[PDB]
Symmetry: D2
Subunit: 303 residues, 4 copies
């Protein structure tokens, strides 16, 4: 039938002291609510198991490490996978990943796709890390993602998830046309991910009142120009004195926003998705094989 | 001072029998009014010297050729260049180009940049030709650009126009992130062009009510993602029984629409442009050198 | 809890020859689908049991009368009421009403609210009839609502429907701030209705490309300024050679569009509704008792 | 000719210590630039001669009074009127009005219309005063307009200004459909005013990211529903540690935003205005005489 119901599980703030066990209870509730509304897949936020720690400068490595996952799923997150399999609803979960390879402690801002059987069918690691690497005094709050993570090493893959071709993006990635295009060329039908986007931008505060605008503009344009359904799940609200943007959403291949959250708390939204709708764009106005002229795009791939 | 006033000269319909002399009178009127409002550059539509002939299926080559320019400017168009130099206002003019090489005819959908001294300082040829190739009987009007024009052979260049770096796009090109990105990488501060966009699309009529949405979405996203000012000049209204989309516009590097037309007739709109505004994006959130990861965008350039 | 899930049942075209029995099958399918997605109420379109007959000029009264309901529900529509009661989902149904009172054949463009028990709990009759009364040759298609209906005689009432205060509007009514305000003053928490809105306006065709814009603008502003959730269910698509606007939607008290259709066929959309959310507006920025100054609004009620 | 060019003079922050002389220099600069761009009228912000003092809790009456005008224009403001007459450009100026009647002080948040001859041709006093009445300790900044001003006593008048019918609104007034409707009924062709709108609202912070949305939604709906051109001039930027919303704008009678500011500093925007454009709405879809049903709007005027 190539039909399904897609859901987004927006998260309200996660406190510094809030435990992973408490967070999983919240994730379970939304996954259950989504299933009750007929959803077959639910998108969760970026770094959805803890508070957004990149806002602080750490001096103790042990303390920094505590915010990362060394297993997936571990005993605490396991319940989410079991419930997903029980109710037949897959999900996209974001978390901080720590893996030791060749004597190096590698840190990634990661997301995984789990199918309706509870099996991990794909992983992606954030390639476009926003922010800075060194502590910057002029900022009211830090954004040290470049210091706490290294660029992803998996490229922008597209995976088969319960008969749907899905690609992942994480937060800032959604603002880069290149990320969307690579997955579009790989045939993605659904492009989804999560985000933590403060409504205040220290470097350019004159853009603060445009935060929602820029976020939604990026989702709509990406979907439209690649003929893909998309979804963005945000962790929102006042988290540790920093306001995070709401407006989690689901978008059609036409760029039309078909579902939008209106609260800054845990909230589930859903939308009926017809995977064949992608054809209205990809077989016509954006029929790549018939219209693209790659011989003129070389500069985009130059190092 | 990095400051200027940009204008867009929207054109109402141009009849099949309307002469180039009559069209020049209309173009001169708008160029003069823009200058009176302080503009230093005015953007005109795609194929701005004739009716949109690609809507018909031609069977006579002599008839087809009549809609093309064999020289630029010819005696009839020259007055526009002279007035531009007199008032100190450059312009972007679209037209059908016919070139004869060793007895072989080359056809392009073209646009040129003329500076405030009336000198041609740049050319661009439409790379993404929309529509179909063969005659399709069911359609109320055809769209045969692929038959009447060859894909441009100049790539997506960026030129110096009176101390402003300007890149050109033509109609359908504005829907392709690749076009915008190439010029963004080349340092464009202003990306502009014209269009003829019917509000009805025979193959996908279910998108007719989204014509304005898709047009504006493309302009906003392109500007924002590349931190560039942009402008789109349309030829609009009921032309030869085909309704063409209005909403000509000027957009800031933030994606904000700063000027918009509301009529479907010849109309001039203007906006103050600060070339240093591009930095709010290009030195921060979209600081290419610091954030882009071209090693992972290779597929975009693969033939 | 004051929580519920609201649904909209958009209808694709209804043919001149399509029977009420066939239409009810379609309505039943959507009501069933909505219930499966957890909805407790579903909004159907204006004149949802037949093709939009006001587009034609009738000379035979018997033929005109055939498009009206003399009972509600009659044997053919009864199944919809039974299913609603079975599944616990109320609905808003629009239809043409014919009633003889005091020797006069009264014709109304009507809508009724049916609760989750299948009981009719309220009626409304369209007060703002758009279009004209006499045949007008210059129009490609007629809009004789003023000829086939008389203004409603029930005012703009607000009813208690399963613990929710609901007010009704029909089509054109949504464009009048007075309609929304009267229901807002009566405490409406949900304001809903249906519509048949052609994408072509004979009197002012220069507004054709703004059809979606004007429709959505009206819904968003109405909701925001009255702190009410709202929903608009359209009968859409190409019906008898006349294209009808899509974009059926559900809107939050903040004016945010939380659900939107993307096809021009029978389509169900849903959204979680928190009746207390109305307080964010009605107890603050739009706290009527604290901010309204009726002594200066007299002209609005002058005859 | 029913034609003119309308301008908006957005103001960047005005410091607590910034003198009226310094502010007039800034106002003169914008009025002169607007004239150079062909404008015949320029709209200035609400309380455009001082910092937004209602953000503080005053304990000294002499201090409060210092922010009010006891005459209009006084020697310091006179130069603005003289230049307006010289260049032929009228304006809408907002200021705090202090009147002494029989030894009793009357306080109003006021705006006046000055024609191109420099003559005061109309006055309006803010009717919908937003905010709270008592000091609220938890708030980072107060909003005590209800304490420092009396509700206007002039109603919502419409005046003749150089052959244009103009109505005035002030800040919060733009959110009330009643204000717009009264002036629409009085035949306003242009409805304009200024505003000071913080991007943060202490009691309902969950609406902070919607500040621009609510502002623009109000302007678009008001214009469309009344078939009137409109303009909103804001005093914006970080003023005394409080961020004020930018996005000053000019809107067509169709609800289309034709001009928008993008900076948070003194900025001039302009737009061509055709007074007969109002007819596209007022003689058709919103032809009051033909469509309105005031006999059913009574509740709106009930005290």
């Amino acid at each position: 039938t190539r039909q399904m119901i897609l859901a987004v599980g927006q998260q309200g703030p996660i406190a510094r002291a809030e435990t992973r066990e408490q967070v999983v209870v919240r994730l379970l509730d939304m996954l259950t609510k989504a299933a009750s509304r007929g959803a077959n897949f639910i998108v969760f936020p970026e770094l959805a198991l803890t508070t957004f720690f990149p806002r602080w400068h750490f001096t103790d490595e042990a303390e920094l490490d505590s915010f990362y996952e060394t297993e997936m799923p571990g005993p605490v997150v396991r319940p989410l996978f079991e419930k997903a399999a029980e109710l037949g609803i897959g999900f996209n979960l974001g978390y901080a990943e720590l893996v030791v390879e060749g004597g190096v402690k590698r840190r990634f801002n990661t997301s995984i796709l789990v199918d309706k059987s509870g099996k991990i069918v794909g992983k992606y690691r954030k390639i476009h890390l926003p922010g800075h690497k060194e502590y910057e005094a002029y900022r009211p709050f830090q954004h040290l993602e470049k210091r706490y993570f290294e660029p992803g090493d998996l490229g922008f893959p597209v995976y088969d998830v319960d008969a749907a071709k899905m690609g992942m993006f994480i937060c800032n990635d959604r603002r880069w046309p290149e990320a969307w295009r690579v997955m579009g060329l790989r045939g993605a039908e659904i492009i989804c991910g999560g985000y933590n986007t403060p409504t205040h931008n220290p470097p350019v505060p004159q853009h603060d009142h445009l935060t929602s605008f820029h976020h939604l503009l990026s989702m709509q344009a990406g979907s439209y120009q690649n003929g893909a359904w998309s979804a963005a799940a945000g962790k929102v609200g006042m988290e540790e004195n920093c306001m995070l943007l709401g407006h989690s959403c689901i978008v059609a291949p036409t760029g039309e926003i078909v579902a939008l959250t209106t609260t800054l708390e845990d909230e589930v939204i859903t939308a009926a998705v017809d995977l064949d709708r992608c054809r209205e764009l990809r077989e016509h106005i954006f029929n790549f094989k018939q219209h693209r002229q790659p011989q003129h795009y070389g500069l985009i791939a130059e190092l």
